[PDB]
Amino acid sequence: TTCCPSIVARSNFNVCRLPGTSEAICATYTGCIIIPGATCPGDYAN
Numbered sequence: 001t002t003c004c005p006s007i008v009a010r011s012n013f014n015v016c017r018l019p020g021t022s023e024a025i026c027a028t029y030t031g032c033i034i035i036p037g038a039t040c041p042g043d044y045a046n
Contacts, residue, residue: 003040004032010046
């Protein structure tokens with residue numbers, strides 16, 4: 001599951017993913033995170 005710290009970060013993440021870039025690279029690129037669960041925390045609400 002991906003969780004993002006802000007709207008901007010999510011929007012950036014989604015563009016990063018368009019060419020097929022791995023989630024892990026898009027995460028470090030944007031500040032979004034990958035978690036094994038489905039429940040994003042309050043400080044990664046977007």
